Amino acid sequence: VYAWNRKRISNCVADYSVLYNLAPFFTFKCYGVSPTKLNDLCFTNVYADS
Amino acid sequence: FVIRGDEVRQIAPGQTGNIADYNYKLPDDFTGCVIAWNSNKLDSKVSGN
Amino acid sequence: ALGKLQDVVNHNAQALNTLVKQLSSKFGAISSVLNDIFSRLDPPEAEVQ
Amino acid sequence: PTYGVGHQPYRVVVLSFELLHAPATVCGPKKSTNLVKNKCVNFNFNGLK
């Protein structure tokens, strides 16, 4: 957590429905966007912090 | 009905999912209560239910 | 000389321009565009925005 | 592994976005339609409805 990994996501088409519809993740909590609307929107400045 | 343990979040209004879309759908203006409890003791078998 | 009539025309045009300008106000919401609000949030919180 | 819930290790991934204020490079699986001129249509350009 002190050296958390940041990955840039760009120039791809993302299907978040396969992430949402798969059931292993206990917490999928979104703040500024609806979970079900992620497939209907286009984004830039996408970052994954692990 | 009987579902999985992790699928209890999909029994809610406005949700997109597999049992939400193709098995049981709730309306946006739904009123009522959802009850979920574990049934491993009764609805499971060692050979596979 | 004709300041009173031009003043009335100015007030009406300025009131319309201010009324048009007021559409660019978030009013304490995440965005000032309604379509973004629909495209981004679930109906329980999008209704509030 | 012997500890109870609340102390077990959890993997957290934070997805950070920006909303519509730049040209977008990551999009959803929606298919592109043809463009029509001089007609009243309900359009969706990169999430802008």
JSON list of N, CA, C and O in Angstrom, two decimals, chain A:
[
{"chain": "A", "resi": 1, "resn": "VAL", "atom": "N", "xyz": [0.82, -1.21, 0.00]},
{"chain": "A", "resi": 1, "resn": "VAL", "atom": "CA", "xyz": [0.00, 0.00, 0.00]},
{"chain": "A", "resi": 1, "resn": "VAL", "atom": "C", "xyz": [0.86, 1.27, 0.00]},
{"chain": "A", "resi": 1, "resn": "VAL", "atom": "O", "xyz": [0.44, 2.30, -0.54]},
{"chain": "A", "resi": 2, "resn": "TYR", "atom": "N", "xyz": [2.06, 1.24, 0.60]},
{"chain": "A", "resi": 2, "resn": "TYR", "atom": "CA", "xyz": [2.91, 2.42, 0.54]},
{"chain": "A", "resi": 2, "resn": "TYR", "atom": "C", "xyz": [3.48, 2.63, -0.86]},
{"chain": "A", "resi": 2, "resn": "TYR", "atom": "O", "xyz": [3.75, 3.77, -1.26]},
{"chain": "A", "resi": 3, "resn": "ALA", "atom": "N", "xyz": [3.66, 1.55, -1.62]},
{"chain": "A", "resi": 3, "resn": "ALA", "atom": "CA", "xyz": [4.22, 1.61, -2.96]},
{"chain": "A", "resi": 3, "resn": "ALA", "atom": "C", "xyz": [3.23, 1.06, -3.96]},
{"chain": "A", "resi": 3, "resn": "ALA", "atom": "O", "xyz": [3.59, 0.21, -4.78]},
{"chain": "A", "resi": 4, "resn": "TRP", "atom": "N", "xyz": [1.98, 1.52, -3.88]},
{"chain": "A", "resi": 4, "resn": "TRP", "atom": "CA", "xyz": [0.87, 1.04, -4.69]},
{"chain": "A", "resi": 4, "resn": "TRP", "atom": "C", "xyz": [1.12, 1.21, -6.19]},
{"chain": "A", "resi": 4, "resn": "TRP", "atom": "O", "xyz": [1.67, 2.22, -6.63]},
{"chain": "A", "resi": 5, "resn": "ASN", "atom": "N", "xyz": [0.74, 0.19, -6.96]},
{"chain": "A", "resi": 5, "resn": "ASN", "atom": "CA", "xyz": [1.05, 0.18, -8.39]},
{"chain": "A", "resi": 5, "resn": "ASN", "atom": "C", "xyz": [-0.02, 0.92, -9.18]},
{"chain": "A", "resi": 5, "resn": "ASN", "atom": "O", "xyz": [-1.21, 0.64, -9.04]},
{"chain": "A", "resi": 6, "resn": "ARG", "atom": "N", "xyz": [0.42, 1.85, -10.03]},
{"chain": "A", "resi": 6, "resn": "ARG", "atom": "CA", "xyz": [-0.47, 2.63, -10.88]},
{"chain": "A", "resi": 6, "resn": "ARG", "atom": "C", "xyz": [-0.26, 2.23, -12.33]},
{"chain": "A", "resi": 6, "resn": "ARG", "atom": "O", "xyz": [0.85, 2.35, -12.85]},
{"chain": "A", "resi": 7, "resn": "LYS", "atom": "N", "xyz": [-1.32, 1.76, -12.98]},
{"chain": "A", "resi": 7, "resn": "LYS", "atom": "CA", "xyz": [-1.25, 1.39, -14.39]},
{"chain": "A", "resi": 7, "resn": "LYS", "atom": "C", "xyz": [-2.17, 2.30, -15.18]},
{"chain": "A", "resi": 7, "resn": "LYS", "atom": "O", "xyz": [-3.34, 2.49, -14.81]},
{"chain": "A", "resi": 8, "resn": "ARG", "atom": "N", "xyz": [-1.65, 2.85, -16.27]},
{"chain": "A", "resi": 8, "resn": "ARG", "atom": "CA", "xyz": [-2.43, 3.67, -17.19]},
{"chain": "A", "resi": 8, "resn": "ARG", "atom": "C", "xyz": [-3.20, 2.78, -18.15]},
{"chain": "A", "resi": 8, "resn": "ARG", "atom": "O", "xyz": [-2.63, 1.83, -18.70]},
{"chain": "A", "resi": 9, "resn": "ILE", "atom": "N", "xyz": [-4.48, 3.08, -18.35]},
{"chain": "A", "resi": 9, "resn": "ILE", "atom": "CA", "xyz": [-5.29, 2.37, -19.32]},
{"chain": "A", "resi": 9, "resn": "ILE", "atom": "C", "xyz": [-5.70, 3.36, -20.40]},
{"chain": "A", "resi": 9, "resn": "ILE", "atom": "O", "xyz": [-6.37, 4.36, -20.11]},
{"chain": "A", "resi": 10, "resn": "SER", "atom": "N", "xyz": [-5.26, 3.11, -21.63]},
{"chain": "A", "resi": 10, "resn": "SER", "atom": "CA", "xyz": [-5.59, 3.98, -22.76]},
{"chain": "A", "resi": 10, "resn": "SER", "atom": "C", "xyz": [-5.55, 3.17, -24.05]},
{"chain": "A", "resi": 10, "resn": "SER", "atom": "O", "xyz": [-4.87, 2.14, -24.13]},
{"chain": "A", "resi": 11, "resn": "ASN", "atom": "N", "xyz": [-6.30, 3.67, -25.04]},
{"chain": "A", "resi": 11, "resn": "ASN", "atom": "CA", "xyz": [-6.37, 3.12, -26.40]},
{"chain": "A", "resi": 11, "resn": "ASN", "atom": "C", "xyz": [-6.84, 1.66, -26.37]},
{"chain": "A", "resi": 11, "resn": "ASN", "atom": "O", "xyz": [-6.18, 0.75, -26.88]},
{"chain": "A", "resi": 12, "resn": "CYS", "atom": "N", "xyz": [-7.97, 1.44, -25.71]},
{"chain": "A", "resi": 12, "resn": "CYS", "atom": "CA", "xyz": [-8.57, 0.12, -25.64]},
{"chain": "A", "resi": 12, "resn": "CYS", "atom": "C", "xyz": [-10.07, 0.29, -25.53]},
{"chain": "A", "resi": 12, "resn": "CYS", "atom": "O", "xyz": [-10.57, 1.36, -25.17]},
{"chain": "A", "resi": 13, "resn": "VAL", "atom": "N", "xyz": [-10.81, -0.76, -25.86]},
{"chain": "A", "resi": 13, "resn": "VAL", "atom": "CA", "xyz": [-12.24, -0.79, -25.61]},
{"chain": "A", "resi": 13, "resn": "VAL", "atom": "C", "xyz": [-12.45, -1.70, -24.41]},
{"chain": "A", "resi": 13, "resn": "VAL", "atom": "O", "xyz": [-11.94, -2.83, -24.38]},
{"chain": "A", "resi": 14, "resn": "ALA", "atom": "N", "xyz": [-13.13, -1.20, -23.40]},
{"chain": "A", "resi": 14, "resn": "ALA", "atom": "CA", "xyz": [-13.25, -1.92, -22.14]},
{"chain": "A", "resi": 14, "resn": "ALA", "atom": "C", "xyz": [-14.67, -2.41, -21.97]},
{"chain": "A", "resi": 14, "resn": "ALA", "atom": "O", "xyz": [-15.63, -1.64, -22.10]},
{"chain": "A", "resi": 15, "resn": "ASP", "atom": "N", "xyz": [-14.80, -3.69, -21.66]},
{"chain": "A", "resi": 15, "resn": "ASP", "atom": "CA", "xyz": [-16.08, -4.31, -21.34]},
{"chain": "A", "resi": 15, "resn": "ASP", "atom": "C", "xyz": [-16.11, -4.46, -19.83]},
{"chain": "A", "resi": 15, "resn": "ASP", "atom": "O", "xyz": [-15.48, -5.37, -19.28]},
{"chain": "A", "resi": 16, "resn": "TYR", "atom": "N", "xyz": [-16.82, -3.56, -19.15]},
{"chain": "A", "resi": 16, "resn": "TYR", "atom": "CA", "xyz": [-16.87, -3.72, -17.71]},
{"chain": "A", "resi": 16, "resn": "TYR", "atom": "C", "xyz": [-17.96, -4.69, -17.30]},
{"chain": "A", "resi": 16, "resn": "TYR", "atom": "O", "xyz": [-18.04, -5.03, -16.11]},
{"chain": "A", "resi": 17, "resn": "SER", "atom": "N", "xyz": [-18.81, -5.11, -18.24]},
{"chain": "A", "resi": 17, "resn": "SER", "atom": "CA", "xyz": [-19.89, -6.02, -17.89]},
{"chain": "A", "resi": 17, "resn": "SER", "atom": "C", "xyz": [-19.32, -7.37, -17.49]},
{"chain": "A", "resi": 17, "resn": "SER", "atom": "O", "xyz": [-19.88, -8.03, -16.62]},
{"chain": "A", "resi": 18, "resn": "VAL", "atom": "N", "xyz": [-18.18, -7.77, -18.07]},
{"chain": "A", "resi": 18, "resn": "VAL", "atom": "CA", "xyz": [-17.60, -9.03, -17.63]},
{"chain": "A", "resi": 18, "resn": "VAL", "atom": "C", "xyz": [-16.95, -8.87, -16.26]},
{"chain": "A", "resi": 18, "resn": "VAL", "atom": "O", "xyz": [-16.65, -9.87, -15.61]},
{"chain": "A", "resi": 19, "resn": "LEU", "atom": "N", "xyz": [-16.68, -7.65, -15.81]},
{"chain": "A", "resi": 19, "resn": "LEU", "atom": "CA", "xyz": [-16.16, -7.52, -14.46]},
{"chain": "A", "resi": 19, "resn": "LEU", "atom": "C", "xyz": [-17.30, -7.46, -13.46]},
{"chain": "A", "resi": 19, "resn": "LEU", "atom": "O", "xyz": [-17.23, -8.05, -12.38]},
{"chain": "A", "resi": 20, "resn": "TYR", "atom": "N", "xyz": [-18.37, -6.73, -13.83]},
{"chain": "A", "resi": 20, "resn": "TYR", "atom": "CA", "xyz": [-19.53, -6.61, -12.96]},
{"chain": "A", "resi": 20, "resn": "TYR", "atom": "C", "xyz": [-20.31, -7.92, -12.87]},
{"chain": "A", "resi": 20, "resn": "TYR", "atom": "O", "xyz": [-20.75, -8.30, -11.78]},
{"chain": "A", "resi": 21, "resn": "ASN", "atom": "N", "xyz": [-20.52, -8.61, -14.00]},
{"chain": "A", "resi": 21, "resn": "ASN", "atom": "CA", "xyz": [-21.38, -9.78, -13.96]},
{"chain": "A", "resi": 21, "resn": "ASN", "atom": "C", "xyz": [-20.69, -10.98, -13.30]},
{"chain": "A", "resi": 21, "resn": "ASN", "atom": "O", "xyz": [-21.38, -11.89, -12.85]},
{"chain": "A", "resi": 22, "resn": "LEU", "atom": "N", "xyz": [-19.35, -11.01, -13.28]},
{"chain": "A", "resi": 22, "resn": "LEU", "atom": "CA", "xyz": [-18.68, -12.09, -12.57]},
{"chain": "A", "resi": 22, "resn": "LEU", "atom": "C", "xyz": [-18.85, -11.81, -11.09]},
{"chain": "A", "resi": 22, "resn": "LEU", "atom": "O", "xyz": [-18.67, -10.67, -10.63]},
{"chain": "A", "resi": 23, "resn": "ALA", "atom": "N", "xyz": [-19.20, -12.83, -10.34]},
{"chain": "A", "resi": 23, "resn": "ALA", "atom": "CA", "xyz": [-19.46, -12.78, -8.90]},
{"chain": "A", "resi": 23, "resn": "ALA", "atom": "C", "xyz": [-18.37, -12.94, -7.82]},
{"chain": "A", "resi": 23, "resn": "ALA", "atom": "O", "xyz": [-18.75, -12.86, -6.64]},
{"chain": "A", "resi": 24, "resn": "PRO", "atom": "N", "xyz": [-17.07, -13.18, -8.08]},
{"chain": "A", "resi": 24, "resn": "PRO", "atom": "CA", "xyz": [-16.15, -13.38, -6.94]},
{"chain": "A", "resi": 24, "resn": "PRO", "atom": "C", "xyz": [-15.83, -12.15, -6.06]},
{"chain": "A", "resi": 24, "resn": "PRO", "atom": "O", "xyz": [-15.43, -12.35, -4.91]},
{"chain": "A", "resi": 25, "resn": "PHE", "atom": "N", "xyz": [-16.00, -10.91, -6.52]},
{"chain": "A", "resi": 25, "resn": "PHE", "atom": "CA", "xyz": [-15.57, -9.73, -5.78]},
{"chain": "A", "resi": 25, "resn": "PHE", "atom": "C", "xyz": [-16.64, -9.32, -4.77]},
{"chain": "A", "resi": 25, "resn": "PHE", "atom": "O", "xyz": [-17.79, -9.04, -5.15]},
{"chain": "A", "resi": 26, "resn": "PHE", "atom": "N", "xyz": [-16.26, -9.30, -3.49]},
{"chain": "A", "resi": 26, "resn": "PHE", "atom": "CA", "xyz": [-17.16, -8.90, -2.41]},
{"chain": "A", "resi": 26, "resn": "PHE", "atom": "C", "xyz": [-17.55, -7.43, -2.46]},
{"chain": "A", "resi": 26, "resn": "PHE", "atom": "O", "xyz": [-18.71, -7.09, -2.22]},
{"chain": "A", "resi": 27, "resn": "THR", "atom": "N", "xyz": [-16.62, -6.53, -2.78]},
{"chain": "A", "resi": 27, "resn": "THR", "atom": "CA", "xyz": [-16.94, -5.11, -2.80]},
{"chain": "A", "resi": 27, "resn": "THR", "atom": "C", "xyz": [-16.62, -4.52, -4.16]},
{"chain": "A", "resi": 27, "resn": "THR", "atom": "O", "xyz": [-15.47, -4.58, -4.61]},
{"chain": "A", "resi": 28, "resn": "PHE", "atom": "N", "xyz": [-17.63, -3.93, -4.79]},
{"chain": "A", "resi": 28, "resn": "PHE", "atom": "CA", "xyz": [-17.52, -3.23, -6.07]},
{"chain": "A", "resi": 28, "resn": "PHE", "atom": "C", "xyz": [-18.24, -1.91, -5.82]},
{"chain": "A", "resi": 28, "resn": "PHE", "atom": "O", "xyz": [-19.44, -1.82, -6.08]},
{"chain": "A", "resi": 29, "resn": "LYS", "atom": "N", "xyz": [-17.56, -0.88, -5.30]},
{"chain": "A", "resi": 29, "resn": "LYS", "atom": "CA", "xyz": [-18.27, 0.31, -4.86]},
{"chain": "A", "resi": 29, "resn": "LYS", "atom": "C", "xyz": [-17.77, 1.51, -5.63]},
{"chain": "A", "resi": 29, "resn": "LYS", "atom": "O", "xyz": [-16.58, 1.84, -5.58]},
{"chain": "A", "resi": 30, "resn": "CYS", "atom": "N", "xyz": [-18.67, 2.18, -6.33]},
{"chain": "A", "resi": 30, "resn": "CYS", "atom": "CA", "xyz": [-18.34, 3.32, -7.18]},
{"chain": "A", "resi": 30, "resn": "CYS", "atom": "C", "xyz": [-18.90, 4.60, -6.57]},
{"chain": "A", "resi": 30, "resn": "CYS", "atom": "O", "xyz": [-19.97, 4.60, -5.96]},
{"chain": "A", "resi": 31, "resn": "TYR", "atom": "N", "xyz": [-18.16, 5.70, -6.76]},
{"chain": "A", "resi": 31, "resn": "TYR", "atom": "CA", "xyz": [-18.53, 6.97, -6.15]},
{"chain": "A", "resi": 31, "resn": "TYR", "atom": "C", "xyz": [-19.07, 7.98, -7.16]},
{"chain": "A", "resi": 31, "resn": "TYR", "atom": "O", "xyz": [-20.17, 8.50, -6.99]},
{"chain": "A", "resi": 32, "resn": "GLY", "atom": "N", "xyz": [-18.31, 8.28, -8.22]},
{"chain": "A", "resi": 32, "resn": "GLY", "atom": "CA", "xyz": [-18.71, 9.30, -9.16]},
{"chain": "A", "resi": 32, "resn": "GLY", "atom": "C", "xyz": [-19.42, 8.79, -10.39]},
{"chain": "A", "resi": 32, "resn": "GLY", "atom": "O", "xyz": [-19.71, 9.59, -11.29]},
{"chain": "A", "resi": 33, "resn": "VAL", "atom": "N", "xyz": [-19.70, 7.49, -10.47]},
{"chain": "A", "resi": 33, "resn": "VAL", "atom": "CA", "xyz": [-20.30, 6.88, -11.64]},
{"chain": "A", "resi": 33, "resn": "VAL", "atom": "C", "xyz": [-21.11, 5.69, -11.16]},
{"chain": "A", "resi": 33, "resn": "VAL", "atom": "O", "xyz": [-20.84, 5.12, -10.11]},
{"chain": "A", "resi": 34, "resn": "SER", "atom": "N", "xyz": [-22.18, 5.36, -11.89]},
{"chain": "A", "resi": 34, "resn": "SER", "atom": "CA", "xyz": [-22.95, 4.16, -11.58]},
{"chain": "A", "resi": 34, "resn": "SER", "atom": "C", "xyz": [-22.19, 2.91, -12.03]},
{"chain": "A", "resi": 34, "resn": "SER", "atom": "O", "xyz": [-21.48, 2.94, -13.03]},
{"chain": "A", "resi": 35, "resn": "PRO", "atom": "N", "xyz": [-22.29, 1.81, -11.26]},
{"chain": "A", "resi": 35, "resn": "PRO", "atom": "CA", "xyz": [-21.67, 0.55, -11.70]},
{"chain": "A", "resi": 35, "resn": "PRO", "atom": "C", "xyz": [-22.22, 0.01, -13.01]},
{"chain": "A", "resi": 35, "resn": "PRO", "atom": "O", "xyz": [-21.47, -0.55, -13.81]},
{"chain": "A", "resi": 36, "resn": "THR", "atom": "N", "xyz": [-23.52, 0.17, -13.25]},
{"chain": "A", "resi": 36, "resn": "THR", "atom": "CA", "xyz": [-24.15, -0.41, -14.43]},
{"chain": "A", "resi": 36, "resn": "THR", "atom": "C", "xyz": [-24.01, 0.46, -15.67]},
{"chain": "A", "resi": 36, "resn": "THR", "atom": "O", "xyz": [-24.31, -0.02, -16.77]},
{"chain": "A", "resi": 37, "resn": "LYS", "atom": "N", "xyz": [-23.55, 1.70, -15.54]},
{"chain": "A", "resi": 37, "resn": "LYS", "atom": "CA", "xyz": [-23.42, 2.60, -16.67]},
{"chain": "A", "resi": 37, "resn": "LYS", "atom": "C", "xyz": [-22.02, 2.60, -17.28]},
{"chain": "A", "resi": 37, "resn": "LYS", "atom": "O", "xyz": [-21.79, 3.34, -18.24]},
{"chain": "A", "resi": 38, "resn": "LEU", "atom": "N", "xyz": [-21.09, 1.81, -16.73]},
{"chain": "A", "resi": 38, "resn": "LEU", "atom": "CA", "xyz": [-19.71, 1.84, -17.18]},
{"chain": "A", "resi": 38, "resn": "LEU", "atom": "C", "xyz": [-19.56, 1.35, -18.62]},
{"chain": "A", "resi": 38, "resn": "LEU", "atom": "O", "xyz": [-18.63, 1.76, -19.32]},
{"chain": "A", "resi": 39, "resn": "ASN", "atom": "N", "xyz": [-20.46, 0.47, -19.08]},
{"chain": "A", "resi": 39, "resn": "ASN", "atom": "CA", "xyz": [-20.43, 0.00, -20.45]},
{"chain": "A", "resi": 39, "resn": "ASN", "atom": "C", "xyz": [-20.96, 1.01, -21.45]},
{"chain": "A", "resi": 39, "resn": "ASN", "atom": "O", "xyz": [-20.78, 0.83, -22.66]},
{"chain": "A", "resi": 40, "resn": "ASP", "atom": "N", "xyz": [-21.64, 2.06, -20.99]},
{"chain": "A", "resi": 40, "resn": "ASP", "atom": "CA", "xyz": [-22.28, 3.02, -21.88]},
{"chain": "A", "resi": 40, "resn": "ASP", "atom": "C", "xyz": [-21.50, 4.31, -22.02]},
{"chain": "A", "resi": 40, "resn": "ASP", "atom": "O", "xyz": [-21.94, 5.22, -22.73]},
{"chain": "A", "resi": 41, "resn": "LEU", "atom": "N", "xyz": [-20.35, 4.42, -21.36]},
{"chain": "A", "resi": 41, "resn": "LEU", "atom": "CA", "xyz": [-19.58, 5.66, -21.33]},
{"chain": "A", "resi": 41, "resn": "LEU", "atom": "C", "xyz": [-18.20, 5.47, -21.93]},
{"chain": "A", "resi": 41, "resn": "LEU", "atom": "O", "xyz": [-17.69, 4.36, -22.04]},
{"chain": "A", "resi": 42, "resn": "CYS", "atom": "N", "xyz": [-17.61, 6.59, -22.31]},
{"chain": "A", "resi": 42, "resn": "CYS", "atom": "CA", "xyz": [-16.26, 6.65, -22.84]},
{"chain": "A", "resi": 42, "resn": "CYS", "atom": "C", "xyz": [-15.40, 7.43, -21.85]},
{"chain": "A", "resi": 42, "resn": "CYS", "atom": "O", "xyz": [-15.85, 8.44, -21.29]},
{"chain": "A", "resi": 43, "resn": "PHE", "atom": "N", "xyz": [-14.18, 6.97, -21.63]},
{"chain": "A", "resi": 43, "resn": "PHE", "atom": "CA", "xyz": [-13.32, 7.64, -20.67]},
{"chain": "A", "resi": 43, "resn": "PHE", "atom": "C", "xyz": [-11.91, 7.80, -21.21]},
{"chain": "A", "resi": 43, "resn": "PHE", "atom": "O", "xyz": [-11.49, 7.15, -22.17]},
{"chain": "A", "resi": 44, "resn": "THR", "atom": "N", "xyz": [-11.19, 8.72, -20.56]},
{"chain": "A", "resi": 44, "resn": "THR", "atom": "CA", "xyz": [-9.76, 8.90, -20.69]},
{"chain": "A", "resi": 44, "resn": "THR", "atom": "C", "xyz": [-9.30, 9.16, -19.26]},
{"chain": "A", "resi": 44, "resn": "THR", "atom": "O", "xyz": [-10.13, 9.26, -18.36]},
{"chain": "A", "resi": 45, "resn": "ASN", "atom": "N", "xyz": [-7.97, 9.22, -19.07]},
{"chain": "A", "resi": 45, "resn": "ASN", "atom": "CA", "xyz": [-7.35, 9.36, -17.74]},
{"chain": "A", "resi": 45, "resn": "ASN", "atom": "C", "xyz": [-7.71, 8.18, -16.84]},
{"chain": "A", "resi": 45, "resn": "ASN", "atom": "O", "xyz": [-8.00, 8.36, -15.66]},
{"chain": "A", "resi": 46, "resn": "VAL", "atom": "N", "xyz": [-7.69, 6.98, -17.40]},
{"chain": "A", "resi": 46, "resn": "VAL", "atom": "CA", "xyz": [-8.08, 5.80, -16.63]},
{"chain": "A", "resi": 46, "resn": "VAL", "atom": "C", "xyz": [-6.84, 5.25, -15.95]},
{"chain": "A", "resi": 46, "resn": "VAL", "atom": "O", "xyz": [-5.82, 4.98, -16.60]},
{"chain": "A", "resi": 47, "resn": "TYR", "atom": "N", "xyz": [-6.92, 5.06, -14.64]},
{"chain": "A", "resi": 47, "resn": "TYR", "atom": "CA", "xyz": [-5.81, 4.52, -13.87]},
{"chain": "A", "resi": 47, "resn": "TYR", "atom": "C", "xyz": [-6.28, 3.45, -12.91]},
{"chain": "A", "resi": 47, "resn": "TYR", "atom": "O", "xyz": [-7.30, 3.60, -12.24]},
{"chain": "A", "resi": 48, "resn": "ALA", "atom": "N", "xyz": [-5.51, 2.36, -12.84]},
{"chain": "A", "resi": 48, "resn": "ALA", "atom": "CA", "xyz": [-5.76, 1.30, -11.87]},
{"chain": "A", "resi": 48, "resn": "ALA", "atom": "C", "xyz": [-4.66, 1.34, -10.82]},
{"chain": "A", "resi": 48, "resn": "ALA", "atom": "O", "xyz": [-3.49, 1.16, -11.15]},
{"chain": "A", "resi": 49, "resn": "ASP", "atom": "N", "xyz": [-5.04, 1.58, -9.57]},
{"chain": "A", "resi": 49, "resn": "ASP", "atom": "CA", "xyz": [-4.12, 1.60, -8.44]},
{"chain": "A", "resi": 49, "resn": "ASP", "atom": "C", "xyz": [-4.35, 0.33, -7.63]},
{"chain": "A", "resi": 49, "resn": "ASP", "atom": "O", "xyz": [-5.40, 0.17, -7.01]},
{"chain": "A", "resi": 50, "resn": "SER", "atom": "N", "xyz": [-3.36, -0.55, -7.60]},
{"chain": "A", "resi": 50, "resn": "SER", "atom": "CA", "xyz": [-3.48, -1.85, -6.96]},
{"chain": "A", "resi": 50, "resn": "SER", "atom": "C", "xyz": [-2.62, -1.89, -5.71]},
{"chain": "A", "resi": 50, "resn": "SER", "atom": "O", "xyz": [-1.45, -1.46, -5.74]}
]
